[PDB]
Amino acid sequence: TRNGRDSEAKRLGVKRFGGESVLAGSIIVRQRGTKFHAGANVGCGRDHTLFAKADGKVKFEVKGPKNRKFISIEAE
Amino acid sequence: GFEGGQMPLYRRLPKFGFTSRKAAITAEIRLSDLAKVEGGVVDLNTLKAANIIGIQIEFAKVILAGEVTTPVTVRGLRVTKGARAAIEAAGGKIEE
Amino acid sequence: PKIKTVRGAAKRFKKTGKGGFKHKHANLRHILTKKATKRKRHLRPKAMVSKGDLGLVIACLPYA
Amino acid sequence: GIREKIKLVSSAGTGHFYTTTKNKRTKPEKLELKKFDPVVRQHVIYKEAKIK
RNA sequence: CCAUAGGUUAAUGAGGCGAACCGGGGGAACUGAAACAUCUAAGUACCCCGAGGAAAAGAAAUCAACCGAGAUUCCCCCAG
RNA sequence: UUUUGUAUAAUGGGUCAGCGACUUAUAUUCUGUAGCAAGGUUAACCGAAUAGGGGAGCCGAAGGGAAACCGAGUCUUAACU
RNA sequence: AGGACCGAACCGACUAAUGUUGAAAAAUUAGCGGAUGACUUGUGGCUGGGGGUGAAAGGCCAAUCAAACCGGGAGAUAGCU
RNA sequence: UGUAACGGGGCUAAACCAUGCACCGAAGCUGCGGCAGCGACGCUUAUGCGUUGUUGGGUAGGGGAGCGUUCUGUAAGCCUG
RNA sequence: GUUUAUUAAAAACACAGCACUGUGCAAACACGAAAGUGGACGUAUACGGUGUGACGCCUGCCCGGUGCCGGAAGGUUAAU
RNA sequence: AAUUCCUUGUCGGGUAAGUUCCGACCUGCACGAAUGGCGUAAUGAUGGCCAGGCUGUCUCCACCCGAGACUCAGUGAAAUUGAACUCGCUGUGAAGAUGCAGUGUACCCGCGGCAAGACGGAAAGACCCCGUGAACCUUUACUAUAGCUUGACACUGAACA
RNA sequence: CUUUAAUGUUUGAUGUUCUAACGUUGACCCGUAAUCCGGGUUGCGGACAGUGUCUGGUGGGUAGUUUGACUGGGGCGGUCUCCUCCUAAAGAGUAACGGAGGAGCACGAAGGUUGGCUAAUCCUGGUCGGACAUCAGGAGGUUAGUGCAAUGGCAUAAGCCAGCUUGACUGCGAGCGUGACGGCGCGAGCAGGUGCGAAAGCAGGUCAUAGUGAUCCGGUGGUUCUGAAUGGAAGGGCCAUC
């Protein structure tokens, strides 16, 4: 046959969920596209990884006219 | 270090450095050893005779480790800043 | 008689103050123009041997 | 893999050089760029040279 | 041709044996490298010659480092 | 005994008695115990001698760096918040 | 005259039976082939192991032969039982 | 190979469905007595002693504590014609 | 005729004959670190190796590949 | 066909009937000319087929003579063997049961026979696989090497063109 | 210097002649009573032959070995590293010789910044012009595009166009993600200097995920770091790289 190949898993997914206290610089989700968009206090890395810029609790919300999922770091 | 036929850790990592010949003949001296010698004047011959450094040693430093309490004359030895401060605080004298 | 040290290991490891071992990073001997400068920069300082493979280097180096 | 690698030597006289690749069949002219030279701590002109 | 080679007496000595040690002339492979050829095992096993109660080595064309030590041999460190 | 699994129709033993298998030397790490303690300890050897002498040496109280070197700090770097 | 014919000693072993812990670690009985020749046999000698010898089967080399036997390296090694 | 597709005998319930009350049934649980491990707690600890919970199937394996055998000191002692 | 002594006697091996090739004698070749010895006290009508196997009729086409023989002008090439 | 798989190719002979044999045919999977082609008198403990004589080889076995087997007296092994108070059937289950479950049958113990079972005995399976196992053998596998061969230097010198 | 020769000398190649080294398994004499051997006379050959050291070719004649693994038993066939979806049971991970496809590159702009723009497809009209070129209008709303496979993204566009440029910088990095480990990946911010923009700011390569090779040994450049008595040097170290 010609179907024996496959690639190693990339271990994506949400790494820190909502209402979790995190330190600055910690990865929140590893994604391929921009499935979740960066909100307040969250930056977008080279491979679309959303990372916290300040210490606080993770906040998920749906915003915008396109109903996009935003991740922000609530103040703490 | 064998891990099956897989290339072992002590061969996966690259070699570094070289062995210095001067480090085998250079020693360090605690402040506590200054009182142990007799005559109050320290140098290479007196330290060797007092079995503190080693017969093959050619250079030696005095370090701020422990503490000295008696006046002592250091001659021909490098001395650190803290060690120098403690020696002079205890009435010592350092020369070259 | 005395145990013979593994000279290959002796040319690659040195014992530190608390009993660990330092080593040079891999992937910095040849082909380098395609590697990101950030990776090379992070690979330049020496590192400490991990807990998993600490036993092997202690076994290979009986005389520190 | 027709793209072969080269080195950009600094014009500051220091031996420093960057390294990259180029397609020598479609771009025969030499490469010149302004890059940082960490020895003199200034951005100087680097010129393409033979990798050797 | 002289001579030399060869031959015949006389005197002195050697030959062969023996457990280990010593010096010399030759000299593997199984094995380890997780295979194997460099390498290791190892100048080991074994064969041969010679000598002695010991043998071999031995009185610097030696080390050291600008200070010095003083033939050879063996033991403990240096040091895995 | 070996196995996922054996009354197994898988292996071994006819039976009894005797013999038969984690030892020894030298180094290294950890635990317990005893001595001494910022010190501990001697090896060959001398010695009529398991005493005593012998501190040649080794480990420890300082480390960082590839190294010169610096030192309760050191390395990187022109310099590190 | 003849590596001629039939056929004993002698040499060999084609077929069957028995025997297969046998009378025998290959033989016995009834048949069979050569039987003056490239025959067969007695006595003594020569060729030694990666070597010999072979009208050639890897046959034979002291009931052992795709490398004899004895001693040594040697308690080889064995991720196997 | 032999009934051989209730384990068998046999059963018109001694089968099936629904409801109800009994009883049998294990090394489960409870009763009585005994041994040992680990945690609380207190004694005046012989450094382990009352009570008190609770645990105790077990291969590879890890940890702890013992019995018995030959020899050496104790031991020219002690037992034995 | 010979052969697997001890499961195979044959179409297998050998054979006289045929052909190719090497060899001019201190021969090639073989056993020997070598001396030497066999070949052979033989000399191309001889000796060794290879293939085929009495006798009758024959052995036809291919030198591209791999060997072997002859040539040395050119390219390349070791020690020195 | 010592060679043809398809194939017992097709036809003819022999037989009542012939996958073998003999004689042709050619569609030679994949004969062939000294790793010789096709014949060949004589020869063969050579391979295949047919015929006459002959027969217990067979239809189909029967009797007889001896040597064992059987009994008595004397001597007296061996392979094997965990222990046995060592039955049949169906099912279960390391999945083919003397040994478990259910049931049937069977008083205790020899002797002569037969060989279905005890996955019987003999030989740590030879076929198969595995081991970074071994031994030989082959070669334009790898790396060497004896031998043969080439040149430089040495033993090795003097004149001339 | 383009253009070549003389006198003598520096040493090679080829050929001829000679004897004295060397060979003689030619003849004769002696040791000798001897087809070995040695010495002598002589004849033939002759600096050839032969032998030693070094060196190229040939060399299963001989020797030491190698000839992988996965595999519904082995061989043959196929596969061995990396990326995308499903298998994968709504966090991560998850096997088969399961189902389907790709990668071993490319780019000095196809990267950075500032400013601007919106496709695919279809209808209608129009010279060559045609079902399909370019033009105008409409419908449509990303069914298009992304340097390439697939998945997840993308209108503030990450898609398309133009100007200026090298942040495809150097030393670092709070804190995480994923690995048994070697390692791989994301990262605000600090210091120096740079590009675009008036500026807030953005820029440590490309919309992201494949585009790859540890160590040893060796090569190049820089740096007194080291340098076996001393001063150098060779060698070694470090940084950059093959």
PDB file of C-alpha atoms (C1' of nucleotides) in Angstrom, chain D residues 1-3 5 15 17-21 23 26-27 31 33-36 38 41-43 52, chain K residues 105-109 165-170 191-194 205 219-222 240-242:
ATOM      1  CA  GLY D   1      18.866  22.862  -3.995  1.00  0.00           C
ATOM      2  CA  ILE D   2      20.386  25.130  -6.641  1.00  0.00           C
ATOM      3  CA  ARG D   3      20.480  28.029  -4.100  1.00  0.00           C
ATOM      4  CA  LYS D   5      25.222  29.741   0.454  1.00  0.00           C
ATOM      5  CA  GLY D  15      36.863  39.952  10.103  1.00  0.00           C
ATOM      6  CA  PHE D  17      30.703  38.233   8.450  1.00  0.00           C
ATOM      7  CA  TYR D  18      27.053  37.254   8.102  1.00  0.00           C
ATOM      8  CA  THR D  19      25.886  34.214   6.150  1.00  0.00           C
ATOM      9  CA  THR D  20      22.934  33.531   3.818  1.00  0.00           C
ATOM     10  CA  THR D  21      21.970  31.914   0.500  1.00  0.00           C
ATOM     11  CA  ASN D  23      20.534  31.889  -6.481  1.00  0.00           C
ATOM     12  CA  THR D  26      19.319  34.399 -11.865  1.00  0.00           C
ATOM     13  CA  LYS D  27      21.121  37.041  -9.730  1.00  0.00           C
ATOM     14  CA  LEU D  31      25.020  41.520  -2.783  1.00  0.00           C
ATOM     15  CA  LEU D  33      23.546  45.415   2.552  1.00  0.00           C
ATOM     16  CA  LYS D  34      23.865  47.501   5.703  1.00  0.00           C
ATOM     17  CA  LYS D  35      24.185  45.201   8.728  1.00  0.00           C
ATOM     18  CA  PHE D  36      25.235  45.688  12.340  1.00  0.00           C
ATOM     19  CA  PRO D  38      29.207  44.117  16.764  1.00  0.00           C
ATOM     20  CA  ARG D  41      29.002  48.744  17.250  1.00  0.00           C
ATOM     21  CA  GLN D  42      27.831  50.491  14.062  1.00  0.00           C
ATOM     22  CA  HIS D  43      25.770  49.518  11.009  1.00  0.00           C
ATOM     23  CA  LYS D  52      35.233  28.936   0.620  1.00  0.00           C
TER      24      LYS D  52
ATOM     25  C1'   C K 105      12.952  23.325  -1.807  1.00  0.00           C
ATOM     26  C1'   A K 106      11.996  28.754  -3.194  1.00  0.00           C
ATOM     27  C1'   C K 107      12.645  34.444  -2.264  1.00  0.00           C
ATOM     28  C1'   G K 108      18.092  40.421  -2.048  1.00  0.00           C
ATOM     29  C1'   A K 109      12.116  40.416  -2.911  1.00  0.00           C
ATOM     30  C1'   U K 165      14.682  50.518   2.721  1.00  0.00           C
ATOM     31  C1'   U K 166      17.618  45.678   5.409  1.00  0.00           C
ATOM     32  C1'   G K 167      14.835  44.189  12.108  1.00  0.00           C
ATOM     33  C1'   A K 168      16.753  38.026   7.088  1.00  0.00           C
ATOM     34  C1'   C K 169      20.439  43.317  13.438  1.00  0.00           C
ATOM     35  C1'   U K 170      24.389  42.040  17.975  1.00  0.00           C
ATOM     36  C1'   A K 191      21.163  48.031  26.334  1.00  0.00           C
ATOM     37  C1'   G K 192      23.530  49.782  21.761  1.00  0.00           C
ATOM     38  C1'   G K 193      22.604  51.025  16.809  1.00  0.00           C
ATOM     39  C1'   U K 194      19.090  50.922  12.260  1.00  0.00           C
ATOM     40  C1'   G K 205      12.547  36.862   8.339  1.00  0.00           C
ATOM     41  C1'   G K 219      39.306  23.376   6.480  1.00  0.00           C
ATOM     42  C1'   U K 220      38.804  29.179   6.502  1.00  0.00           C
ATOM     43  C1'   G K 221      38.617  34.078   9.120  1.00  0.00           C
ATOM     44  C1'   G K 222      38.913  36.781  13.870  1.00  0.00           C
ATOM     45  C1'   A K 240      31.603  32.965  13.271  1.00  0.00           C
ATOM     46  C1'   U K 241      31.345  29.161   9.617  1.00  0.00           C
ATOM     47  C1'   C K 242      32.275  24.918   6.036  1.00  0.00           C
TER      48        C K 242
END
